[PDB]
Amino acid sequence: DLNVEIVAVERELWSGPATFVFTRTTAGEIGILPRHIPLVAQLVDDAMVRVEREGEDDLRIAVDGGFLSVTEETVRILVENAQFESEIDADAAKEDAASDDERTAAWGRARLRALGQI
Amino acid sequence: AEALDPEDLEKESVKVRKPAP
Amino acid sequence: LDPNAIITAGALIGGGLIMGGGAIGAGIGDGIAGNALISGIARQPEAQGRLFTPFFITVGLVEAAYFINLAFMALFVFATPGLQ
Amino acid sequence: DLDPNAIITAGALIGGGLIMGGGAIGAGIGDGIAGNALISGIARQPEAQGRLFTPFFITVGLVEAAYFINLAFMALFVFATPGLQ
Amino acid sequence: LDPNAIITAGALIGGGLIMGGGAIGAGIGDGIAGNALISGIARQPEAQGRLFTPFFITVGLVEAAYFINLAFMALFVFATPGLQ
Amino acid sequence: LDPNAIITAGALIGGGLIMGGGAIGAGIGDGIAGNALISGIARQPEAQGRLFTPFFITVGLVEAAYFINLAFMALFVFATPGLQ
Amino acid sequence: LDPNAIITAGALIGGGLIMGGGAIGAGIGDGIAGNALISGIARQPEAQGRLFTPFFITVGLVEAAYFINLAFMALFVFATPGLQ
Amino acid sequence: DLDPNAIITAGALIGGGLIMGGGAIGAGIGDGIAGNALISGIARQPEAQGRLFTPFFITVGLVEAAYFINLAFMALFVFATPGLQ
Amino acid sequence: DLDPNAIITAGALIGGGLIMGGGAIGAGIGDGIAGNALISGIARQPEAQGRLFTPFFITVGLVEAAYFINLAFMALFVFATPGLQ
Amino acid sequence: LDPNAIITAGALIGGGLIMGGGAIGAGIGDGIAGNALISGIARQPEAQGRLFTPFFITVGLVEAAYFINLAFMALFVFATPGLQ
Amino acid sequence: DLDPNAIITAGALIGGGLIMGGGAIGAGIGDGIAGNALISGIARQPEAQGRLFTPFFITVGLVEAAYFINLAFMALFVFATPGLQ
Amino acid sequence: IKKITKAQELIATSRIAKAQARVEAARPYAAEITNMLTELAGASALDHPLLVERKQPKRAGVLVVSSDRGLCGAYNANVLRRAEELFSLLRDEGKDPVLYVVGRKALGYFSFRQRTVVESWTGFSERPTYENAREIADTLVNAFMAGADDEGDDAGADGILGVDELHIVFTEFRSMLSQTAVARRAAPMEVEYVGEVGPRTLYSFEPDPETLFDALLPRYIATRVYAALLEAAASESASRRRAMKSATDNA
C-alpha cells in the first residue's frame, strides 16, 4: 500500500492508505502504484484525483492548483483548493463550467470530472 | 526615523542541497 | 540460353527488391506513427478524437509509397520493360 | 545448355526471399515499436490497457497487413512464377 | 549470348534497388515526421493548425528524395544507359 | 550443366535472405519491446505483471513473423518450389 | 560474350546500390531532423523562426551525403570507369 | 564446364553469410537497445539494480534466441547443405 | 569466355557501389540524429546555440569522416582497381 | 573454370556479408549503449562508477556477437567448407 | 573457360565492398547516437563537457574499433586475397 | 464599558486560539512546498527572474500588513513604525518605496501622511484566507516582473512601471506575550546552499525541472504571504486581548 496525503494550503484535507492513485498531470494521465519511482509533477488546471482504497469506494477529488509528489512510501498532492465528490455542488459546477473566466472554468470542469459527468 | 539594521531585514531564501559553487 | 529467361530472372529479383524495400519502409513507418498514436491516446484519452486525422495523414502518406512500389513490382513481373 | 526455366526459377526464389526478408524486417520492427508504445502506456497508467488495445490493433493490424501482402506475392513468385516459359 | 539481355537484367536489378531504397527512406522518414506531428497534436490541441508547416516541409524533402529515386529507376528501366 | 544445381543455389540464397530478414526483425523488435518492458518495470515495479501481458502480445507477435519466415526457409531448402 | 555488357551490368547494379543507400540515408535523416523541428515548434511556438537555422544545417548535411552518391551514380552508369 | 556441386556450395555459402549477417545485426542492435534501457534504469535508481536484470535477461534471452538459431541453420547450410548433389 | 578484366571491373563496380551505399546510409542517419540533438538543444535554450555547435561539429566530424573514407576506397575500387589483371 | 574458384568467390562474398552484418550490429549497439551511458553520466555524475557494470555487460554482449561473426569469417575464407 | 583468378578477385572485391558498407553504416549511426547523447548532455549541463568526454570517447572508441577492424579485414580481402590462385 | 471590554478580551482569547489553530493547519503545506522547491532548485538552473537581483535597483514594493478593527493596543503602531524604519533604510540604499497595504488602519495612517498607496486590501485581516494571499502575491509578483524591463523611470516594453524588490512588514507572533513587527524581503529570494543530505535516487520531473520551478516559485511566494497574513491575524488577536485586559483593568 501507499500513503496518500492531500494537503491544501489552508489545511491538510485527507490522509490515508491507498492502492492506486490516478491523476492527470501536465504531461498526461498518470497512475501511481505502491513502489512508483520518485516524481514531481504539476497537475492539470482542471485535474481530478482518484484514490482507490482497499475495501472502500474510490475517493474522487476535484483539485485546484495541484502539485504531485511521489516519494518512497508516500504520495502527496499539494493543492490550492480541493473538494471531495460528495461536497461538489453539481449545479454550481455546471454553471461555472464554460464560464468566461479561465480559472473559474477550470475549477468547474474539475468538479464536473470528479462528479463523473466529465 | 532610524533605518533598519540591514541584518535585521529577514531575507527569503531558496535552500539548495548542493555544495557552495 | 534464352535471353528472355535472363531478363525475367533479373525482373523477378528487381521486383523482390521492390517489395522488400516497400515492406520494410511501410512496416517501420507505420509502427512509428502508431507508437505516436498510442502514446498520445495513453497520455490524453480525449485526444483519440482529434488524433486519427494526422495519423491517417501519416499512414496514407506511408502506404502511398508502399503501394506505389507495388505497382512498379507488377510492372517488372507482368509487363517487364525491355523484355525481348 | 542452361535450362531457361532453371534461371527463371532461381530468380524467382531469390526475389521471394527478398520479399520475405523485407516483410519480416518491417513486421518485426513495426510490431516492436507499437508494442513499446503500448507497454510504456501501461507502465505510466496501468489502467489504460483496455483503451490502448484499440489504437494498438489499428497499428499492428495494419503493419501485419503489409507483411501478409508480401506473403501473398512471394507465393505468386515461387509457386506460380510470372514469366515462366 | 545477347548483350542486351544482360544489360536489361542488370538494369532491372538496379531499378529494384533504387525503388527499394527509396521506399525504405520515404516510409521511415514519413513515419518519423508523422510521429512528431501526432505527438505534438496530442499534447496540445491548439498547435494542430501551426504544426503542419514543418511537417509538410519535412514530408516535401522526404518525398523529393523518393521521387528522385523513382525518376532514376524509370531512367534505368525504360531507357537503360549503355544499352546496346 | 544441371538445372537443378542453379535452382538449388537460388533456393539457398533465397532462404538465407528469408532467415536474415527474420533475424533482423526478431532481434530488433524484441530489443525495442524489452526496452519498453525494462523502462516500465523501472517506473512502476508493481505493474510488472500487468506489463507482461502486452509484452508477450508484442514478443509473441514478433516471434511469429520470425518463425513463419523460418518455416518458409525450410520450404525453400528442403522442398524447393519449382525444382525439377 | 561482350565484356562491355558485363561492365555495364555491373555499373547498373552499383549505381542502384549507391542511389538506394543514398535514398535510405536521406529519407531517414530528413525524417529525424523533421521530428526534431516539429517537436521543438510544438514545445515553444515562439522558437519557430529560430529552429530553421539548425534544421536547414542538419538537412544541409544529410543531403550532402545523398546527392554526392547521386553525383557518383551518374558517373557509374553514364561514364563507367574502366568501360573499355 | 563447372561442377554443379560448386554452384550448390557457392549458393549455400552466400546464404549462410546472409543468415549470419542478419543474425549479427539483429542481436547487436537488440542487445544495445535492451542495455540502453537497463543503463538508464540503473542511472535513475541504484536499488533497481536488483530487479531490472529480470526483464533484461528476458529481453536478451529472446534476442540471442534468434541469433543462435541463425547460427544453427547457417551451420546446416554450410556443413550439411540441403539439396547437395 | 571473355576478358577476365571485364569480370574484375564488374565486381569492383558492385563493390564500390556497396561501399558508397553503406557510407551514405551511415552518414545520412548519423547526421540526422546529431542534428536532431542539436535542434532539440537549441529549442530548449536558444542562447546555447553557439555552444552546442562545438560538440555537434565534432560528432559530424566523426560521421562524415567515415563516409569520406568510403569515398576514398571506393575510388581505389573503381578508378584504380586492385587485382585488375 | 575449376569449381574451387566458384566456391572461393562464394566464400569471400559470404564472409563479406558476415562482417558487414557484424559491423552494423556492433556499431549501432555500442552507439546505443554508449548513449545510455553518456546520458546517465550527465544526469548523475557520481553514478559513473555504478554505471559501468551494466554498460560493460551490454557491450560484452554486442561485441561478443561481432567477434563470433569474425570467427566464422575465418572459417569461410581461410578453411572454406565444401572446398574441392 | 574463365580465368579463376578473375572470379576470385571479383568475389573478393564484392566481399570487401560489403565489409566497408557494414563498417560505414555501423560507424556513422553509432557515432551519431553517441554524439546525440553528448550534445543533449551539453545542452542540459553546459559545463559537463569535461565529464562527458570520457563516456563519449569510450563509445566512439568501440565504434571506430569495429569500423577499423572491418577496414583491416577488407584490406586483407582486396590486396592479400585468401584462396587466390 | 468594563462589561464590553471584558467581553472583548474573552472573545479575543477565543480568537487567538482559532488563529493559532489556523497557523498550525498551514504548516504541513508550507513544509512540503518548501521541500519541493528545494528539490526543483537542486535539479534546475537558478536564473529565474525572482531569484536574480536586479542591477541598479531603484524601486521596492513594501507590503504593510495592519488590521481592520482598531481595538488592538499598539499592533498597528508598531507595524507602521517598522514600515517607516524600512522606508528610511530603502532611502539610504537609494530606493523609492512603492507601497501596498493590507487593512484599513495602515490605509488611514498613510493617507494622513500623504504617502501614495499603489493598492490596498481590506476586510480580512481578522481571518485571512488563501484567496486573499494569492491575490496579494499575484499583484506583488506582477509588479516585480514588470520591474524587469524598466529603465531609468521608463516602464520599457512592459508599458507598466514595476519594482526591483519586494518586502513585507508584518507582526510575527512569537508567543502569547511577544509579538514583533518584522520586515522580510520576499523577493528576490536569496539562493543559499546547504550540505549534501537524498540525491542517490534522482527525482523524475514532469515535464522538466525548469517548467516546474517557474510554476512553483510564485506559489511559494503566495504561501509565504499567506503565512505572514496568518501570523499577523494571530498577533492582532493577541494584542487586542492584551489591550482589552488593560482597558477593563483601567475601567
Numbering used by the authors:
A (entry chain H): 3 to 120
B (entry chain C): 525 to 545
C (entry chain M), E (entry chain N), F (entry chain T), G (entry chain O), J (entry chain R): 3 to 86
D (entry chain L), H (entry chain S), I (entry chain P), K (entry chain Q): 2 to 86
L (entry chain G): 18 to 214, 217 to 270
Study text:
The mycobacterial PS is made of two proteins, bδ and b′.
In the tethered forms the mycobacterial-specific extensions of the α-subunit make contact with the γ-subunit. In the first element described before, residues 520 to 548 extend from the C-terminal region of α-subunits and provide a “hook” which catches into a “loop” provided by residues 212 to 220 in the lower globular domain of the γ-subunit, thereby tethering the stator and rotor together and inhibiting rotation. An important feature of this tether mechanism is that it is unidirectional, operating only in the hydrolytic direction of rotation when their interacting surfaces have complementary charges. In contrast, in the synthetic direction, as the interacting surfaces are both negatively charged they will repel each other, thereby preventing an inhibited complex from forming. Despite the symmetry correspondence between its F1 and c-ring domains in the structure of the enzyme from M. smegmatis, a symmetry mismatch between the two domains persists here also. The presence of this mismatch is demonstrated by catalytic states S1 to S3, which do not display threefold symmetry and are not separated from each other by 120°. In the mycobacterial ATP synthase it is not known whether the ε-subunit, which is observed in the “down” position in the structure, can also assume the “up” position, but there is no evidence that it does so.
